[PDB]
Amino acid sequence: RIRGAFIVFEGCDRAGKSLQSRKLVERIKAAGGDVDLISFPDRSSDLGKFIDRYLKKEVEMDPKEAHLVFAANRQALMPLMMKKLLKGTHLVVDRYAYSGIAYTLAKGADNITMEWAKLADMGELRPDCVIYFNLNFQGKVSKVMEQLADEDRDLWKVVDASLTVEEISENVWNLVAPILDNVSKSLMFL
Amino acid sequence: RIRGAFIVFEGCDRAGKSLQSRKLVERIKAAGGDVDLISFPDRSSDLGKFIDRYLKKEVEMDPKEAHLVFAANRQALMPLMMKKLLKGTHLVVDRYAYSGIAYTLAKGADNITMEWAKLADMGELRPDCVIYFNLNFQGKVSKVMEQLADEDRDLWKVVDASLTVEEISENVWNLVAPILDNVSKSLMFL
Numbered sequence: 001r002i003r004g005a006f007i008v009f010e011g012c013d014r015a016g017k018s019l020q021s022r023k024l025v026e027r028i029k030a031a032g033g034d035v036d037l038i039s040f041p042d043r044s045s046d047l048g049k050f051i052d053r054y055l056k057k058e059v060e061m062d063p064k065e066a067h068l069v070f071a072a073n074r075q076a077l078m079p080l081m082m083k084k085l086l087k088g089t090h091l092v093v094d095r096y097a098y099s100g101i102a103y104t105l106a107k108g109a110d111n112i113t114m115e116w117a118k119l120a121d122m123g124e125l126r127p128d129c130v131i132y133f134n135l136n137f138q139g140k141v142s143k144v145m146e147q148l149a150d151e152d153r154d155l156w157k158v159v160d161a162s163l164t165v166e167e168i169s170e171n172v173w174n175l176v177a178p179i180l181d182n183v184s185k186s187l188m189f190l
Numbered sequence: 191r192i193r194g195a196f197i198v199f200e201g202c203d204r205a206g207k208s209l210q211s212r213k214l215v216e217r218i219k220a221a222g223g224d225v226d227l228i229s230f231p232d233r234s235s236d237l238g239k240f241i242d243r244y245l246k247k248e249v250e251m252d253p254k255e256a257h258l259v260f261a262a263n264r265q266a267l268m269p270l271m272m273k274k275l276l277k278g279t280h281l282v283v284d285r286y287a288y289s290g291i292a293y294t295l296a297k298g299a300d301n302i303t304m305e306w307a308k309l310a311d312m313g314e315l316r317p318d319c320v321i322y323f324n325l326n327f328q329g330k331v332s333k334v335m336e337q338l339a340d341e342d343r344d345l346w347k348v349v350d351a352s353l354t355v356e357e358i359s360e361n362v363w364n365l366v367a368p369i370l371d372n373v374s375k376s377l378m379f380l
């Protein structure tokens with residue numbers, strides 16, 4: 001067993017996650033490393049195109065409905081992701097189950113709790129590290145992201161997404177690099 | 191609290207569930223009762239039309255993906271269903287979470303268990319009675335339906351779907367009628 005690391009980037013919209021994920025992937029390749037970039041929702045599947053329609057406000061879904069649909073989109077990619085990590089390929093993943101929970105809880109729907117919202121993604125891979133880009137609807141998403149982060153300060157590392165692009169990139173590298181060495185370990189699951 | 195009963199019909203395809211559900215609804219109305227008929231998957235929503243495309247083999251979904259999507263389609267209707275029962279309206283429901291489990295387990299996918307498959311539908315209403323129409327892919331769906339039925343012989347009543355239409359209708363009435371009187375009770379959940 002020689003496995004890659006599983007790195008998740010989380011945060012509110014506009015936090016520069018998309019760019020910082022491409023940069024981390026570039027640093028890992030500059031270290032001769034094998035790495036793939038995954039982004040959720042995965043819009044390339046049939047369900048992902050439905051989700052894209054949802055995000056464009058062309059189709060509607062209730063809170064619990066939408067929660068399970070975004071989770072199904074993640075569950076769909078677990079065989080591919082497990083194969084890649086086991087081959088030794090690192091995964092950098094932009095948004096994951098935590099976005100799923102935070103965006104679902106921020107809707108304030110009746111009869112949803114955090115305990116309920118954790119059921120949908122059970123069995124999915126657990127990341128070796130979650131990088132949270134810390135920078136209204138987005139305001140309550142951040143509140144949930146803070147509660148998740150403080151629930152598990154082992155997994156969650158918080159970067160200052162207000163600093164410069166190159167500066168954030170540097171701080172992310174400094175957190176992630178020790179993990180790349182240390183994991184080559186059993187897979188962890190939610 | 192004066193609530194209606196929640197009756198689920200389950201079984202393999204071709205078991206006459208669709209007709210027997212319309213007949214039960216007719217008997218309840220003939221008893222002056224308020225009743226609505228619900229069928230899953232609910233093809234009238236945006237997600238339900240996606241599911242219809244799935245069943246027509248026009249879109250694809252992996253086992254775990256499909257499981258959560260069919261479950262989201264059920265979760266979507268829970269506010270409506272709870273409102274109806276609380277108003278005293280009986281619900282006769284053709285297919286439910288149990289079909290969801292059975293059809294999902296019959297695919298024989300890797301890394302699915304019955305324990306996993308029960309997570310998606312948690313929080314949904316639990317029926318007061320499940321009528322199982324007892325009459326290859328459909329062969330393993332029946333095997334799962336038998337295991338579910340024998341797990342909980344309080345809830346599950348098994349009818350002989352080989353007898354005549356009018357005869358099955360009679361046997362279903364004889365099981366359901368005592369429940370209609372007795373529930374008018376707290377709601378039960380999965």
Ligand SMILES: Cc1cn([C@H]2C[C@H](O)[C@@H](COP(=O)(O)O)O2)c(=O)[nH]c1=O
Pocket residue numbers: 013040041055070071095096097099100101103104
């Ligand atoms: C992964 C995920 C994303 N989202 C949202 C966050 C974004 O507003 C949107 C698309 O994200 P994106 O901009 O990163 O593509 O989908 C959810 O609502 N639930 C989820 O589970």
Ligand SMILES: Cc1cn([C@H]2C[C@H](O)[C@@H](COP(=O)(O)O)O2)c(=O)[nH]c1=O
Pocket residue numbers: 203230231245260261285286287289290291293294
């Ligand atoms: C409710 C439900 C139905 N199904 C299947 C059973 C049928 O083959 C099909 C449509 O059922 P229908 O003929 O009762 O409309 O969908 C699932 O695969 N999963 C589910 O959760």
